[PDB]
Amino acid sequence: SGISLDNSYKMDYPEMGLCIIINNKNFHKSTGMTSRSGTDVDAANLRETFRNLKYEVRNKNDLTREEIVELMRDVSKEDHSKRSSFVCVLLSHGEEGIIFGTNGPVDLKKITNFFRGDRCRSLTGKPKLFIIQACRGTELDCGIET
């Protein structure tokens, strides 16, 4: 065939891939974390948006730190051979490098490590997208008038 360039990811596999949405709104009282009002609006918006991009969306609500790790591990163990990519959306409280389960923190690195090129072979060479809606600290941007 003619000249072949590989500047774009192959996104024509039979399936676009999974879109895992973790929506944490209610947190255990003991954590002292407040409810995240309006997060359901985000969760629904994402479900529809990615549905239209042909992603197999799976919504999970109010997951403990244990359940988040278990979910990610299980998902990374699936056969993504026929999938073009992987998308994970995290909606919760957070700190730099951390996402909160309903009962405690989860290091983002622990979550993403399951998908490393050497740990999830069926996703090796494929785009792995993590969308994070959570604080990364307490700093506030005062902005500048333009």
């Binding site: 990811y9 985000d42 994402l46 948006t49 785009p127 994070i132 809606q133 990364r136 941007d141 005062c142």
Partner: protein, 93 residues
Amino acid sequence: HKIPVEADFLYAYSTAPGYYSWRNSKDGSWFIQSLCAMLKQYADKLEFMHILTRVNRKVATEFESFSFDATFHAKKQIPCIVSMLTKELYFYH
């Protein structure tokens, strides 16, 4: 013969390192609102990084906090695109 194990990852953060992330109880978070709007309008036209750049501009220009608490009033937000991708990404083909 090998590729980095950290290659082909894209982290679309709602905010810059060390910063707070704003949410509107009625409309949803500034970032997700903007991300979905831009994907809906440009997913069949622009490369992913360019879509995310539009998201950065939308969040940066169209949102500002309002609070009775001076500490949290009139604040802004800029998302943070972290790419370890090795190719351009188009949701269409």
